């Protein structure tokens, strides 16, 4: 069930809509969500991972992902949470004071349902 954080449904990028985007110079997390996005209407290893999590707001399932340290993160997948923790351990402060199992118990989903990354 799709839905955005503002309480409105995601927006579809049609045939006429994509022809405009192709002529403009790429934008609004197109690489992860080109067709259905919530951002349409209203260099290090850790950096790339933070850029992905930044794009979780544009996800057509952003409402389901963000709503269940004071760290605002979407419900991550078991493998990705573990990956993000170790890659951003020296860069994010509180990460060195905890373990991967402890961090992913509160920030990752063990249910087996929808989790971030949405995209493959
Ligand atoms: O032609 S469009 O598909 O681009 O739709 C044009 C505008 O329709 C609204 C409001 O409806 S209206 O008042 O009757 O004009 O929303 C409609 O579109 C979304 C899907 O997004 S999409 O990219 O426009 O296709 C529907 O949501 S959902 O079915 O995917 O859940 C809306 O359904 S609903 O209101 O949530 O029930 C649908 O409305 S309706 O069924 O046609 O009535 C506008 O969206 S709005 O600006 O957020 O109010 C669209 O305007 S827009 O400028 O293209 O954004």
Task: Determine the Cα–Cα distance for residues 69 and 75; give it in Å rounded to an integer.
Answer: 15
Element (H, E) at 50: helix 45-54
Domain ranges of the chain: 11-109
Atom of ligand 1 nearest to the CA of 41: 55
Measured between alpha carbons, how far apart are the two ends of the chain, in Å? 19
In 3D space, the residue among 33, 21, 26 whose CA is nearest the CA of residue 59 turns out to be 33
Candidate from 2, 8, 41, 63 with most ligand 1 atoms within 8 A of CB, to mutate:
41
Beta carbons of 7 and 38 less than 8 angstroms apart = no
Method: X-ray
Ligand 1 cavity residues, CB under 6 Å: 8-9, 11-12, 41
Atom of ligand 1 nearest to the CA of 11: 23
Can you give the resolution of this entry in Å?
2.8
- Residue 35 CA, ligand 1 centroid: distance in Å: 15
Element (H, E) at 9: none
Task: Determine the Cα–Cα distance for residues 89 and 32; give it in Å rounded to an integer.
Answer: 25
């Amino acid at each position: 069930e799709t839905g955005c954080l503002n309480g409105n449904p995601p927006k579809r990028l049609k045939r006429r809509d994509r022809r405009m985007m192709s002529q403009l110079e790429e934008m609004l997390c197109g690489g992860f969500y080109p067709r259905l996005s919530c951002c349409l209407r209203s260099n290090t290893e850790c950096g790339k991972l933070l850029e992905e999590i930044k794009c979780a707001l544009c996800s057509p399932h952003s409402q389901s992902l963000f709503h269940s340290r004071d760290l605002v993160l979407p419900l991550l997948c078991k493998d990705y949470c573990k990956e993000f923790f170790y890659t951003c351990r020296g860069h994010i402060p509180g990460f060195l004071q905890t373990t991967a199992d402890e961090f992913c118990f509160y920030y990752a989903r063990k249910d087996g349902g929808l989790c971030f990354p949405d995209f493959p």
